[PDB]
Design a protein around this nucleic acid. Sequence first.
DNA 1: ACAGGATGTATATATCTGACACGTGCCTGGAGACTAGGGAGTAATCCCCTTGGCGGTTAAAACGCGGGGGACAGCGCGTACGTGCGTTTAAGCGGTGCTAGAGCTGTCTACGACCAATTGAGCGGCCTCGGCACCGGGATTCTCCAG
DNA 2: CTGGAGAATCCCGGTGCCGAGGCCGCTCAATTGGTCGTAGACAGCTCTAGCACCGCTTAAACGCACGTACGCGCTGTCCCCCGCGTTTTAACCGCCAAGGGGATTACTCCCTAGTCTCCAGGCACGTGTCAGATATATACATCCTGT
Lengths: 85, 84, 94, 94, 98, 98, 104, 105
Amino acid sequence: HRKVLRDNIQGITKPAIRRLARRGGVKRISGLIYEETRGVLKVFLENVIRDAVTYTEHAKRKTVTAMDVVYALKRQGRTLYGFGG
Amino acid sequence: HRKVLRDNIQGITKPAIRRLARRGGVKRISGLIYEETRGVLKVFLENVIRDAVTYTEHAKRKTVTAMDVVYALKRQGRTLYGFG
Amino acid sequence: KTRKESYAIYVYKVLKQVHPDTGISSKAMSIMNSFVNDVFERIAGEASRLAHYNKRSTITSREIQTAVRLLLPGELAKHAVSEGTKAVTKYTSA
Amino acid sequence: KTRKESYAIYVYKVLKQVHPDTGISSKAMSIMNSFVNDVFERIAGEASRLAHYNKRSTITSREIQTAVRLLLPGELAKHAVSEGTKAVTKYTSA
Amino acid sequence: KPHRYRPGTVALREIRRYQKSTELLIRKLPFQRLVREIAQDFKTDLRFQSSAVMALQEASEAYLVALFEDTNLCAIHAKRVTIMPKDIQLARRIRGER
Amino acid sequence: KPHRYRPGTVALREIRRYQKSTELLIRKLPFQRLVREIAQDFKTDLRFQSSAVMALQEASEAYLVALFEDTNLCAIHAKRVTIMPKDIQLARRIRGER
Amino acid sequence: TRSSRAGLQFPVGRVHRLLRKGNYAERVGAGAPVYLAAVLEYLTAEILELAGNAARDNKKTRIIPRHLQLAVRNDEELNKLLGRVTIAQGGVLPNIQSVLLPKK
Amino acid sequence: TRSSRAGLQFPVGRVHRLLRKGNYAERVGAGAPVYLAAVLEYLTAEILELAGNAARDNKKTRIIPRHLQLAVRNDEELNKLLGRVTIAQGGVLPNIQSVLLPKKT
DNA sequence: ACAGGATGTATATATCTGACACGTGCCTGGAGACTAGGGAGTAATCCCCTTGGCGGTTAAAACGCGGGGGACAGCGCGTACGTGCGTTTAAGCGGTGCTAGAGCTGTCTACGACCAATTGAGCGGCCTCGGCACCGGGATTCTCCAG
DNA sequence: CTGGAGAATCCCGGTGCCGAGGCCGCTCAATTGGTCGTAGACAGCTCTAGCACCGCTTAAACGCACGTACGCGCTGTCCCCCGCGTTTTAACCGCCAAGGGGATTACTCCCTAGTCTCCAGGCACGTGTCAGATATATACATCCTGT
């Protein structure tokens, strides 16, 4: 098959952005914070996924693994333990 | 071989910090900015030449060179061309 | 002196290709020299660990293509890959 | 299956040296594992960049002493390098 | 009898809870569909390990949460206790994200 | 008539000059004595090539200059046009120093 | 057991392999993996120690990655070694800015 | 030359020796520094090109490092490759915040 | 400024259950005992390039003195978002099915080091003049204090 | 509200001089040409782990009201810092001296790659508990009115 996915950027709920702000120590959240928050998360995942796909096409493999993206997070100076490497 | 030295941190003058700030695009400078600026510059140079003197010590040489500090600047993520 | 290598005559040659009647100063030439070294160890190191991940022991042009597609931002990647494939094939035709 | 090593037995042994009647969970075990791989590649990498300046192609212990005295900040650099001299000298005196 | 609280007791007690706990808190299927839909642009017909989606979830929480740390210090440095989108834009320029 | 220029014409015109120029600002011998003085602590009786002193001068001015860029964005984000030391402390915290 | 030839508990041979098989130099001396193994046992030792006391403060026996989170982020030097590293399932230290505290 | 075997102006042998002598891989393939010399020729041509355009557009006949400063910092992508790199005798590209410009009529 | 609902939160106690600390087996990578070429410690020297001093000028720094505008506290007024309750609603779960592709292992093969003679190519020494400074004079533009 | 000192800034012109560019020898690293074990493309299986699907519960997400407090613009009031003349004063510059230490070249030699075999250390793999989540019931800590 070939599935098509549309408009998952609104799936990041307004209470979820509230909750991450609560972990960050943010008391009160203004109006248009959520639009820009989905935008910033969108940009960051676009870069990380682009570099992960580049890590995955080079092994000529159809499946992206977790070592792929821990490597891609390492190279952008955002190293993340707990998945190997 | 007994060269002694002390109190050069006031040698960075108030108009010199004014000139660097005005290269940075800064209009008005408060009063206590200068002492803190000497402190920040002191911390940065302490780290940079603490790391540079170790490169000069590993070759067992007594003279710090330009490649020394460009390499030690590179390692701190502040790479600076024009010397090597 | 001991014969230090450089890149300076090559940078001068590309200067003759782009703007053929135009000079360049000496410290700018040393800037471009250290630039070429800096990029050179960037994609060389990216080729090192990018070849280390796949349990390989060889740096071929596919690895340099991937690593350029990691460091070069976007539009700068594409024409680098077009000149790269043009130089691989243009080399290989002889 | 396909064997792939770790540090988990060794991390478990140092945990038995420090607080011996106190265990460890598995996610933290794999985090410690990738931690010591991270520090291992920082120090081995700094040994590469440091050997690559002095026209030398050999990594002895002294380069690891200098590279530890560049990575680790201050106090744990002192006790780290002091334990390193304890292990070189405690090694060779045997 | 409203049984209500100030606007900020639920906030500050909520900061004690969500700073206190650790678990993953953007829902796994909308996040997973989000990663797949962003992933379709560079190349098509993909497949993901599950723990990789966990890993991108960790990068999402780390980068967003740290961005609210610095955004919160930005707005507190304006004598404001409420963050606003220009503060987000400030901390992104200070980290060099343009 | 005593003749003067306002608070801002010397400022903005002189910003146009010292942004427009290229050379190195803080003087050679006090800076050189500074680097030697901080250098005496980690090791006694050092020696410097002159160009290395120019190198520490160049990276030190570029790091301070970038710090005033960013603390200028900090204090402008408070609707102020004057650098104050807590703004310096802010930009140093957001870059991850303290 | 060259660990026993040096008095440690880290694999000198496995680390020695990993120095020889990563293309760092062309050749690797004798004493070096003893040295690097000693340094890593030191770092490992106090990081697990601070997770030890800061594990006992949660009255547990098993260290979870939360204990590695605040065990790193409480000391200055371990934080400065790891200031660019995210820990999965870590969370944050309870930092609260003082203007948010309810001050009647 | 192998630069003429590929139609370039970069040293395939010198770059090739530099790939073999930094311990990056025990084996180094056939046509790798051909590809890499192509990439560096493109990058060199881009920066020297923009310093040429800025070199006429600030009325000199010789590239100085100031023209490398505002040559690099005006393209977006060349700046993103070099965003952590200071270049000496560069100075600052002229940026003025909007609140500093005078509030005239 | 105290008192009480209340209310979210800290404190024993069981309880299942399962994740981890552990015992069995194995196999291969650590190691152990040699050799050998070469990387490097170690000496000595060449000289050069860092340091040091001293006098002469002086751009810059210091400092005193207006003065005004920029920080900041108060303060009033709007609005937007935190709080909480009824509605929905699709996320989690939890099982079930299907097969695409990671991974393994084997096959066969085109390709990078090893030497090893051959040579022009980039590099250092050494000229040489034209472009940038650089005064030096001079019309433009912009600002700031007036109408 | 709009117009002139006048001061800073920009536009040509000879000068000089020196650093950019080019030319002549010239060591040596590229080059060319063969080999050779081997890393790796390449084929094929396998089975396992990712993807798909369907029903049920429901925590969580959604949406309406509401109110107050947080943002923010105006007002005044002070002072700290900007601007500019005046002194000084130490930085800059030229040159002269001395040698300590970097770079070089050689000398000698210990040492760490390289080989082959030998074995137990750790690592895959069952296993069954005791540590913790989960109720579950229970008495404090602090919030929020209302006094």
